[PDB]
Swiss-Prot record:
Location, primary (coarse class): secreted
Signals that turn on the gene: Transcriptionally regulated by SicA and InvF. Also regulated by InvE.
Gene it is expressed from: sipD
Keyword NADP: no
Shown chain mapped onto the complete sequence: 129 to 335 of 343
Species, as recorded: Salmonella typhimurium (strain LT2 / SGSC1412 / ATCC 700720)
Entry's family note: Belongs to the invasin protein D family.
Name assigned to this protein: Cell invasion protein SipD
């Protein structure tokens, strides 16, 4: 509607420009595959690319509300109306991340609670059978599809909300999670927490050997230290995963804010 048309172009151009920067960033990374910073730059670009496409696909809904709000002018005021009239985008981007981190945190806490009773299960003798029972139970619980396991889509209330495969795969790639996290359900797909560390744990407990009468298992210090270390390392992986999702969320907040600045500056210039 008049000045909105300009804003629509800005998204198109932005989407085009980003599509190119995602490629440029992927190349730079290819040349130095193990660089932490190059990987994040590439991924930020992808996240940003997905964000503009998101906005692009919500053009109709968003422009409608913004136009209304407009039909009633400070730059700060423009920025504010844009800020409260783009939930279509906000809820499907930041809302998702908010949910990803909330769910992964609860998942990690559930694990922490299990660690709490390790001493109670301890050459050395470890209550192998009972520790593995809690781990295996944790796995089966978080290996289901419900509001305690799903990262994307956000599960709003009672029932199970799914997405198309491409949508879920896009979030799978943005969160950089393994394929084991992608699950089918009903008409679509969902992204759930990574259980690989837990499964590796119970798996390694099995490698300690069959227990005895106590159903427990005693082992010399060498064998125990190596087990305790491999175990702690798996816990660290889950901790690392939680932290990377948190950092991606924080990065997303900044990309979202920048998009709002662009959107606002355009609308402003268009009204002049």
């Amino acid at each position: 509607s008049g000045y909105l048309d300009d804003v629509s172009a800005k998204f198109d151009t932005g989407v085009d420009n980003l599509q190119t920067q995602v490629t440029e960033a992927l190349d730079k990374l290819a040349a130095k595959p193990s660089d932490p910073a190059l990987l994040a730059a590439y991924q930020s670009k992808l996240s940003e690319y997905n964000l503009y496409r998101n906005a692009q696909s919500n053009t109709v809904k968003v422009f409608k509300d913004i136009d209304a709000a407009i039909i009633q002018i400070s730059d700060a005021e423009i920025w504010d109306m844009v800020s409260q009239n783009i939930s279509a985008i906000g809820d499907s981007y930041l809302g998702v991340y908010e949910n990803v981190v909330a769910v992964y945190t609860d998942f990690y806490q559930a694990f922490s609670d299990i660690l709490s009773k390790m001493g109670g299960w301890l050459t050395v003798k470890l209550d192998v059978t009972s520790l593995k029972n809690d781990l295996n139970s944790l796995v089966n619980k978080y290996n289901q599809i419900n509001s305690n396991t799903v990262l994307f889509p956000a599960q709003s209330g009672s029932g199970v909300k799914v997405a198309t495969e491409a949508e879920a795969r896009q979030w799978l790639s943005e969160l950089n999670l393994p394929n084991s996290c992608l699950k089918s359900y009903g008409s679509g797909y969902v992204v759930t927490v990574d259980l690989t560390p837990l499964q590796k744990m119970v798996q390694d407990i099995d490698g300690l050997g069959a227990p005895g009468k106590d159903s427990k298992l005693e082992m010399d210090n060498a064998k125990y230290q190596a087990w305790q270390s491999g175990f702690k390392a798996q816990e660290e992986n889950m901790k690392t995963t939680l932290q990377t999702l948190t950092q991606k969320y924080s990065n997303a907040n900044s990309l979202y804010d920048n998009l709002v600045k662009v959107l606002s500056s355009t609308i402003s210039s268009s009204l002049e």
